Design a protein around this ligand. Structure first.
Ligand SMILES: [Ca+2]
Ligand SMILES: [Cl-]
Ligand SMILES: [Cl-]
Length: 75
């Protein structure tokens, strides 16, 4: 399944995922492509912040869905 991840600056990347993938899995994939550590990532879909432990299917994220990625600094 192909999805998109987009930032506030308009950068868009593509990921290959499965419905059963967790949000934590997706953050790992973004880190592989773009080097952003999962701790600093927050994903949003349909105006809601997503939870690491839940799955893409939980949020009805499908082929060609776009997730919004934003930073949240830990320190
Ligand atoms: Ca690029
Ligand atoms: Cl990927
Ligand atoms: Cl940001």
């Amino acid at each position: 399944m192909q999805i998109f991840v987009k930032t506030l600056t308009g950068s868009t990347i593509t990921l290959e995922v499965e419905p059963s993938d967790t949000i934590e899995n997706v953050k790992a994939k973004i880190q592989d492509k773009e080097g952003i550590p999962p701790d600093q990532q927050r994903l949003i879909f349909a105006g809601k912040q997503l939870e690491d432990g839940r799955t893409l299917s939980d949020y009805n994220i499908q082929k060609e869905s776009t997730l919004h990625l934003v930073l949240r600094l830990r320190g």
